[PDB]
Amino acid sequence: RTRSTISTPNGITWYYEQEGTGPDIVLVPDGLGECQMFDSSVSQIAAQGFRVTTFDMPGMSRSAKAPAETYTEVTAQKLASYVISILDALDIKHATVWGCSSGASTVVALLLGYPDRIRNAMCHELPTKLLDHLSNTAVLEDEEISNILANVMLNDVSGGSEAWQALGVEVHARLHKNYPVWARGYPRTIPPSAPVQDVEALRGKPLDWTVGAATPTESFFDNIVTATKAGVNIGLLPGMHFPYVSHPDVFAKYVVETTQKHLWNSS
Amino acid sequence: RTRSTISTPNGITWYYEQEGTGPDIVLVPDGLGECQMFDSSVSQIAAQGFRVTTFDMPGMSRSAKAPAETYTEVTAQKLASYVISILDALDIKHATVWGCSSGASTVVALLLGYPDRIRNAMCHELPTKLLDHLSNTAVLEDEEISNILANVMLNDVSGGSEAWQALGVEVHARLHKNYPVWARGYPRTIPPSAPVQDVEALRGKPLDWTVGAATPTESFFDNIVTATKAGVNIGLLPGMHFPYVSHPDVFAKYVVETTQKHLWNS
Numbered sequence: 076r077t078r079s080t081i082s083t084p085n086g087i088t089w090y091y092e093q094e095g096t097g098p099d100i101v102l103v104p105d106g107l108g109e110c111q112m113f114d115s116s117v118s119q120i121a122a123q124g125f126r127v128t129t130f131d132m133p134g135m136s137r138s139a140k141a142p143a144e145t146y147t148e149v150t151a152q153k154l155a156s157y158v159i160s161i162l163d164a165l166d167i168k169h170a171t172v173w174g175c176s177s178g179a180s181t182v183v184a185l186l187l188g189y190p191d192r193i194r195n196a197m198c199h200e201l202p203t204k205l206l207d208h209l210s211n212t213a214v215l216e217d218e219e220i221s222n223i224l225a226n227v228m229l230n231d232v233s234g235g236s237e238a239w240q241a242l243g244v245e246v247h248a249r250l251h252k253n254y255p256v257w258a259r260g261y262p263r264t265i266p267p268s269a270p271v272q273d274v275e276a277l278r279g280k281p282l283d284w285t286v287g288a289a290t291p292t293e294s295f296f297d298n299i300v301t302a303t304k305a306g307v308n309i310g311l312l313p314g315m316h317f318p319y320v321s322h323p324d325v326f327a328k329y330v331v332e333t334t335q336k337h338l339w340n341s342s
Numbered sequence: 343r344t345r346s347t348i349s350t351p352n353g354i355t356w357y358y359e360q361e362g363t364g365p366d367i368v369l370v371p372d373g374l375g376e377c378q379m380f381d382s383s384v385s386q387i388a389a390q391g392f393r394v395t396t397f398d399m400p401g402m403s404r405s406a407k408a409p410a411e412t413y414t415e416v417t418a419q420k421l422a423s424y425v426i427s428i429l430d431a432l433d434i435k436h437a438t439v440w441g442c443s444s445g446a447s448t449v450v451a452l453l454l455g456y457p458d459r460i461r462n463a464m465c466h467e468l469p470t471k472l473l474d475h476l477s478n479t480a481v482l483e484d485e486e487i488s489n490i491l492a493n494v495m496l497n498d499v500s501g502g503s504e505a506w507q508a509l510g511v512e513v514h515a516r517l518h519k520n521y522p523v524w525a526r527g528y529p530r531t532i533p534p535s536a537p538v539q540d541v542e543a544l545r546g547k548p549l550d551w552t553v554g555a556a557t558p559t560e561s562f563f564d565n566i567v568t569a570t571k572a573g574v575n576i577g578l579l580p581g582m583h584f585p586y587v588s589h590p591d592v593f594a595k596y597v598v599e600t601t602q603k604h605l606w607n608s
């Protein structure tokens with residue numbers, strides 16, 4: 076496993092990890108931007124004959140050395156441009172991509188905006204609606220935000236409390252710092268940027284969409300409706316918002332099988 | 343509120359309730375077949391200018407005087423035929439219908455099978471897949487079944503435990519007796535009978551489909567997919583499997599507003 080940093084012309088110094096040889100699979104984090112959440116799955120996926128790349132997102136965790144524009148007023152389209160920049164730096168020309176949450180928005184924007192670069196995209200629980208209770212955290216003090224959102228992550232959306240806690244002190248200390256950054260740059264601007272207003276643009280695209288099996292129906296109801304309207308493959312993963320944490324083996328198998336499906340269809 | 347009984351020539355003596363005057367709205371119970379779950383909402387809906395009818399289902403609660411075939415090997419098509427028989431007996435010629443669970447299967451079967459009789463149907467959380475863990479309760483002893491399913495209702499799918507408990511001791515005593523009847527006669531045969539194999543048959547029909555907002559996505563995921571494929575209105579009610587128990591005012595409002603929408607359209 077390569078663990079290193081790389082700087083892109085847009086001023087971001089990325090922390091990234093890479094393991095394996097074979098077709099490229101890129102795991103884009105959710106809004107918290109923390110790629111250690113992929114640790115177990117990276118090895119399982121790479122072992123099936125893929126080169127797997129992941130990274131902390133700009134302004135978050137180990138990728139914090141970045142211009143303020145990259146973690147304020149954040150949109151799917153901004154994030155997609157940043158991901159393209161690190162793929163360029165790493166000489167990854169053709170990638171399968173995964174993303175959850177703002178990462179889901181990002182990978183659909185990637186697929187639509189850079190079709191020559193993206194073999195297929197897997198999106199999970201893509202936020203399309205403004206949620207005032209999240210947006211309103213942005214005006215609180217840093218420690219108040221971190222306390223509130225740490226609680227929300229563990230109790231409301233982790234999909235597995237034991238697994239979430241078992242990420243450990245080092246990861247959670249990084250998440251603690253990230254929560255105010257996410258709170259002030261994401262909730263207000265990510266949902267209106269969702270690249271799913273044009274249903275016909277999605278039709279026929281190599282997109283595989285999932286929602287958590289245990290997630291309350293109302294949370295990503297709109298995803299299921301939108302995917303079905305566009306004829307896009309839609310299904311479920313165990314857990315809720317973080318299947319790569321709660322169910323890393325099932326997650327890895329899904330990513331491998333889905334990538335294999337598209338490698339067959341490509342030929 | 344009229345509370346009475348009526349006997350249909352298929353051998354069922356129904357317990358039923360009616361309140362109000364105006365267009366007919368009929369509330370079909372879920373598989374537990376217990377119409378006291380509608381008590382609050384019946385009054386609220388009727389007050390908006392409707393005649394509201396509901397009833398215990400065959401073999402359940404106060405409608406227990408019924409032949410074994412009406413509560414064993416139960417299908418959506420069987421239940422639809424029974425509901426038509428009581429509508430006939432009460433001289434209800436054109437009805438808006440609500441149903442959840444097996445009641446949802448029933449009202450879709452009613453709409454498709456008897457389009458002249460059904461103004462519009464509201465279906466909620468319609469089961470289309472066999473669940474082994476539910477089917478397997480059919481071979482346990484009665485008291486084992488009641489203990490298991492009473493817990494599942496209270497703690498897993500009620501959508502509001504306080505409201506569920508507040509149905510009261512008499513209701514839960516009736517449910518206690520119903521759980522084994524439901525276990526033996528419904529889970530194994532209701533889902534394969536789901537009238538949703540033909541999406542094109544649903545298209546353009548006066549159907550409004552809901553799922554509980556708090557229900558785990560995987561429970562009625564298929565409902566949302568099927569409704570969307572057919573272009574059928576699909577949305578959410580608060581709670582889970584029993585919105586008429588957990589959120590009776592919201593439930594009543596939904597039934598009234600949906601009926602009014604279709605009265606305008608017609």
Ligand SMILES: C[C@H](O)CCCC(=O)CCC/C=C/c1cc(O)cc(O)c1
Binds near residue numbers: 204263
């Ligand atoms: C992991 C996630 O990317 C960031 C933490 C917030 C969270 O998990 C809440 C549940 C999912 C909501 C995502 C969401 C919701 C919004 O209204 C706006 C937005 O930008 C993202």
Ligand SMILES: C[C@H](O)CCCC(=O)CCC/C=C/c1cc(O)cc(O)c1
Binds near residue numbers: 499583
């Ligand atoms: C109230 C409900 O009508 C009867 C109690 C069982 C329950 O609530 C479990 C959750 C919803 C499942 C209904 C269901 C599931 C099946 O596999 C087969 C079937 O016939 C009905």
Ligand SMILES: [K+]
Binds near residue numbers: 321322323324325326
């Ligand atoms: K697993």
Ligand SMILES: [K+]
Binds near residue numbers: 588589591592593
């Ligand atoms: K209510």
